Amino acid sequence: GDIAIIGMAGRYPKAKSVAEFWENLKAGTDCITEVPKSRWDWKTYKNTVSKWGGFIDDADCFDPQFFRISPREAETMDPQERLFLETCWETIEDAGYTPETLHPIGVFAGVMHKDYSLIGAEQLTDPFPVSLNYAQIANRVSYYCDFHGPSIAVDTVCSSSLTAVHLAIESIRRGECEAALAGGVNLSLHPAKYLSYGSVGMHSSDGRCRTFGEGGDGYVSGEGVGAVLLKPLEKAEQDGDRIYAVIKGSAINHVGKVSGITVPSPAAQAEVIKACLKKAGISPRTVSYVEAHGTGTSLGDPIEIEGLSKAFSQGTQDQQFCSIGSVKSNIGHAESAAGISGLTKAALQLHHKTLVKSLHSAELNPYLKFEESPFYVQQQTAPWKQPSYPRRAGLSSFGASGSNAHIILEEYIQKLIPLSARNKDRLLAYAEKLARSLSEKTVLSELAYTIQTGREAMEERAVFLVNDIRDLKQKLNDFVKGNENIPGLWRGQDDSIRLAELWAEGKTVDWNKLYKPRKTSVPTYPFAKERYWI
Amino acid sequence: GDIAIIGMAGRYPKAKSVAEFWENLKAGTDCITEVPKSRWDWKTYKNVGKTVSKWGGFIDDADCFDPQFFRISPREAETMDPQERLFLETCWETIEDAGYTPETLGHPIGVFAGVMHKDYSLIGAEQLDPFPVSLNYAQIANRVSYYCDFHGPSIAVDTVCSSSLTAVHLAIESIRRGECEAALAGGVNLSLHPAKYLSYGSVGMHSSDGRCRTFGEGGDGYVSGEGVGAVLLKPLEKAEQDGDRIYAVIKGSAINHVGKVSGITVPSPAAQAEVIKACLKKAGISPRTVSYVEAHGTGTSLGDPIEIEGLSKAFSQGTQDQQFCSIGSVKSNIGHAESAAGISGLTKAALQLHHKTLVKSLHSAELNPYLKFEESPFYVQQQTAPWKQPSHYPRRAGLSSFGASGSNAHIILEEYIKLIPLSARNKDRLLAYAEKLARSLSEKTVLSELAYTIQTGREAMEERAVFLVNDIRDLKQKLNDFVKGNENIPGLWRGQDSIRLAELWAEGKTVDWNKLYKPRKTSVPTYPFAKERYWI
């Protein structure tokens, strides 16, 4: 029943990749900025409407030619769709798979806004296709990758990307798919959301999510796109996959009748948490980190603690044994991508055995009584100490109109470099991106296995024959700086040299015949960053 | 693993209820009209190589709601997407049609809504002093869970045209694994803003005559339709043991995606055949035993032949017999209800099973000449007629819904083989209730079933009128006297041993009517929601 997380990718505020996301989390970086001019001018509305957001870079950019999509079609495609496509491609690559090697594969996308529909409608020049639905966000992935499993967009507002994961997990567990991509996307492209949520008081007056901190009076909207590739644990183990973390349980529910549709319910939150702990078969005493929903609201924050404390109580009376935090303190409330950002953070912490700082709570919310609870707020990045049993994390996401989700994760306890891209420019970018990732911790055999068997063999090719990582780094740099005659590099459009020669010429090599090293994260395809808009 | 359909409700073009829907289906009524002026003026776009469509299937009173019933303010009702308003009333109806209240039905009851458009967001954004624009789907499902106090999964899903079948599929799976004990599933679609028409017109999706000519000659696109609907689903064994009224049984559902096809909006016969085979295998039945299929059936020149090719391929493993299975589509009647297309099709298929009647499929008197029905399992249903006993085995129907961007669904369904305490929120609604109830009475109604259902399957609301009645004729006379404004009537107690029970109830006590007993549940008219207009 357990599900392995075998691949992850995404883009978040100040993070072009999960790797940059992780560095920013460890550093405690506040990633919120003012609304960029290229989206709208916040000064237009200063008479207050929030001027802050977590924004991703290059939200309007895409590489349609990679996918054989025309420029015209790219312009009409919702950026959310464009970015989720790239992200899913990257997630599969992070896992060390190609669509071929990975067809009952599901795609489950959380999404709650369609800003590009508003933008398209304003522009309705002669008629053109406005992006009016969600489904293509998921369906485009299934289409391009030739996947036949369920392909669904779901909206539960703030919990949407956990709902998406829950549905992917259940689909895998009943055998409807063998693996699935699950995640979410959220882009802030048009000011209507800021005006509208401002009119209801949802946005904080300082532009921060002060997770369990003093003075919190709302949230700050954030952008994000992210996915995880999920597979049954046992299969992932047999296939020699790299497993970031194991999902032991997920549960969803609704608040039912409470005083107002947007009032969160401690009882219903405790309910979903207990249901998930029971599905996972674990005691709450064994959970040593929780990734809270954590939006920084004066009503919300105390309720979230009350719901967690009630759930944990049927099960222990020990106090302050579990750390808590939220990624919202770093990047804001990514809305439909809130669950996927939180799950990505949780899985990284587990994989890296590191708990990161939760921001904006140096002064705690004075009403929360953490001393009388299971929890303390993580105030510095530090090693995650061996619990004493495995490191286990809970993860919560609570939709504004009542749909709740909780997931429990557990830590997982266990040459020829053929690079290719669509063209020469993308290949040089690939080589530079690969070179920069290399350090004394890179494992050559795993790097090579993953590039050989977990990347598509594309049009423009550069194969390197290398002794070790230092030799690889030197060759990539020589290639990048345009050096002409590089020994041990073959270029084009079981003897190593011959294999190389043949691959550079365009032949298919069955690299598997040579063997398995374990799969390992390698930088993913360097999509061109070209702008497309209506 | 079989799932009972125990309650259904909905509104569709020319149909204020499922019962009007059924009558229109039997009659072969073409429900398509020109765009009503109250939505937009189609003449605005008549000169914008296909012209912007001036046709749709439109429901009446799309902009109406009874917010006071739900204790929603007028201001909140204006800001609420009409899709959310109507789905709320429709789920209320569905539960009432099943003979339940939220209390007697329920915690773990799921709500799963298919949705693919948010025209009210466009309308809201045009009008943007700040106010809340309806920018998400989730409240469509979540408001139902909220109001009814349900704690199960509450999800909106979008797989475009297949959305409501995807919704049903998810509800079934949820019930089968024990996450919900019952679930509402359905969909909603409203055509409130012209962007979709301009947009879908630009790509040629809309037909030039404003019809879905399901398997008929000359079909060149579809006509957009409005609809809202839901079904209440429950495990068959539990529905039997609770004495529910079962319209039909769902034996299997399956969903998939087309994967890589020549263009994202091109349908795939292989993938359609695979979803149909997967569903038949889940249901455990041979395709030779399917005697009706509710086709996706949009009337497009590419779509229609592909659908027949997919169905033929799936049925062929199973059999070589020809023309043993009738086929048709509700889209020929009401248009392509988009996110609500699956729920309208499922509702038609369940009705046909329950009533043992196959209805006419429109606009195919001339068949699409490329189809070759003679070499296939199928013939198009051209008249409404009795559904003949298949031979002995049950009447079984397949039901298909194929999303424009590739998400497919198929479902297989099988046939399933005194004191009147009326109440409403206020006096005006109670008079309307009595009039609606009176009109539904005929020599076919059975008093003991009617009384059981009003007693145990309706909430005891604020304004009350209890009648003590000897038979249906006595009931009808009393309701008519009440409606014409008589305040005092023998055997009527009003307020805010039969006689004492009545007295007590009229005074405001709650009475446990079950103690008196079970008659089978039946459909009785549902709450007469006020039709008041709310807009931004």
Angle value at C-alpha A15, between A11 and A20, nearest 5 degrees: 115
Other residues' Cβ atoms within 10 Å of the Cβ of residue B27:
12
- Closest residue in B to A76 (Cα) is B199
DSSP B189-249: E---STHHHHHHHHTT-B-TTS---TTBTT--SB-BB-EEEEEEEEEHHHHHHTT----EE
Q: What is the DSSP letter of A99?
A: T
Cα torsion angle, A311, A314, A319, A322, sign:
negative
Q: Residues of B with CB below 8 A from A80's CB?
A: none
B48, B159, B407 member nearest A127 (Cβ): B48
The number of residues in chain B equals 536
Q: Specify the residue for token string 């996947």.
A: A147
Spatial contact of B14 and B24, defined as CB atoms under 8 Å apart: yes
CA distance B503 to chain A (A): 31
CA-wise closest residue to A320 among A309, A310, A328: A309
CA torsion, ordered A410, A414, A417, A420, to nearest 10 deg? -30
- Closest residue in B to A163 (Cα) is B155
Q: What is the 3-state secondary structure (H, E, C) of B109-161?
A: EEEEEECCCCHHHHHHHHHCCCCCCCCCCCHHHHHHHHHHCCCCCEEEEEECE
What is the bridge-based pairing of β-strands A105-110 and A179-186?
A: parallel
Cα torsion angle, B284, B290, B292, B295, sign:
positive
* Rounded-to-integer distance, Cα B265 and Cα B250, Å: 29
Distance of CA B532 to the CA centre of its chain: 22
Q: Residues of B with CB below 8 A from A170's CB?
A: 173, 177
What is the bridge-based pairing of β-strands B64-65 and A3-11?
A: unpaired
CA distance B201 to chain A (A): 8
Side-chain half-sphere CA neighbours of A344 within 13 A:
35
Compute the count of residue pairs across chains A and B with CB atoms less than 8 Å apart.
235
* Rounded-to-integer distance, Cα B222 and Cα B212, Å: 5
CA-wise closest residue to A226 among A178, A306, A161: A161
Q: Tell if the CB–CB gap between B116 and A134 is shorter than 8 Å.
A: yes
Distances (CA, A) of B498 to B99, B467, B487: 22, 10, 21
* Rounded-to-integer distance, Cα B499 and Cα B8, Å: 34
Q: Tell if the CB–CB gap between B146 and A113 is shorter than 8 Å.
A: no
Give me the domains of chain B, ranges plus CATH numbers.
Answer: 1-448+518-536 (3.40.47.10), 449-517 (no CATH)
CA distance B532 to chain A (A): 22
Distance of CA A355 to the CA centre of its chain: 18
CA distance B241 to chain A (A): 27
Q: Tell if the CB–CB gap between A154 and B149 is shorter than 8 Å.
A: no
* A199 SS3 class: helix
The kind and range of the H/E element at A109 are strand A105-110
* Rounded-to-integer distance, Cα B358 and Cα B381, Å: 7
Q: Residues of A with CB below 8 A from B258's CB?
A: 142-143, 148
- Closest residue in A to B264 (Cα) is A143
Interacting residues of B47 by C-beta distance below 8 A, sequence separation 6+: none
Interacting residues of A152 by C-beta distance below 8 A, sequence separation 6+: A106, A107, A108, A109, A135, A138, A164, A167, B157, B158, B159, B166, B407
- Closest residue in A to B127 (Cα) is A192
Spatial contact of B452 and B466, defined as CB atoms under 8 Å apart: no
Residue type, B213: R
CA torsion, ordered A62, A63, A64, A67, to nearest 10 deg? -130
The kind and range of the H/E element at B466 are strand B463-468
Tokens of A216: 């919190």
* Rounded-to-integer distance, Cα A153 and Cα A282, Å: 31
Strand ranges, E, within A411-467: 416-421, 460-465
Q: Please report which residue ranges of B375-492 form alpha helices under DSSP H.
A: 427-440, 447-456, 472-483
B150, B195, B198 member nearest A256 (Cβ): B150
Bridge partners of A382, per DSSP, are A355
Q: Tell if the CB–CB gap between B201 and A255 is shorter than 8 Å.
A: no
Q: Tell if the CB–CB gap between A135 and B195 is shorter than 8 Å.
A: no
CA-wise closest residue to A214 among A66, A368, A323: A368
Residue type, B415: E
Distances (CA, A) of B20 to B52, B388, B402: 30, 24, 27
Other residues' Cβ atoms within 10 Å of the Cβ of residue A445:
13
CA-wise closest residue to A420 among A431, A432, A409: A431
Q: Residues of A with CB below 8 A from B109's CB?
A: none
Angle value at C-alpha B374, between B371 and B379, nearest 5 degrees: 80
Report phi then psi at A246, rounded to 5: -115, 130
Spatial contact of B137 and B158, defined as CB atoms under 8 Å apart: yes
DSSP B381-411: --S-EE-PPP-----EEEEEEE-TTSEEEEE
CA-wise closest residue to A524 among A124, A93, A52: A93
Instruction: Give the CA radius of gyration of chain A.
Output: 23
CA-wise closest residue to A384 among A317, A290, A319: A290
CA-wise closest residue to B118 among A98, A428, A192: A192
Spatial contact of A122 and A187, defined as CB atoms under 8 Å apart: no
* A105 SS3 class: strand
* Rounded-to-integer distance, Cα A280 and Cα A272, Å: 12
Instruction: Give the CA radius of gyration of chain B.
Output: 23
Interacting residues of B184 by C-beta distance below 8 A, sequence separation 6+: B91, B94, B95, B109, B110, B111, B112, B144, B171, B230, B231, B232, B233
CA distance B65 to chain A (A): 18
What is the bridge-based pairing of β-strands B3-11 and B227-235?
A: antiparallel
Q: Tell if the CB–CB gap between B405 and A198 is shorter than 8 Å.
A: no
What is the bridge-based pairing of β-strands A245-254 and A403-410?
A: antiparallel
CA distance A237 to chain B (A): 26
Interacting residues of B434 by C-beta distance below 8 A, sequence separation 6+: B422, B465, B479, B482, B483
Q: Tell if the CB–CB gap between B405 and A196 is shorter than 8 Å.
A: no
B138, B158, B195 member nearest A130 (Cβ): B195
CA-wise closest residue to B251 among B410, B479, B466, B424: B410
Spatial contact of A144 and A67, defined as CB atoms under 8 Å apart: yes
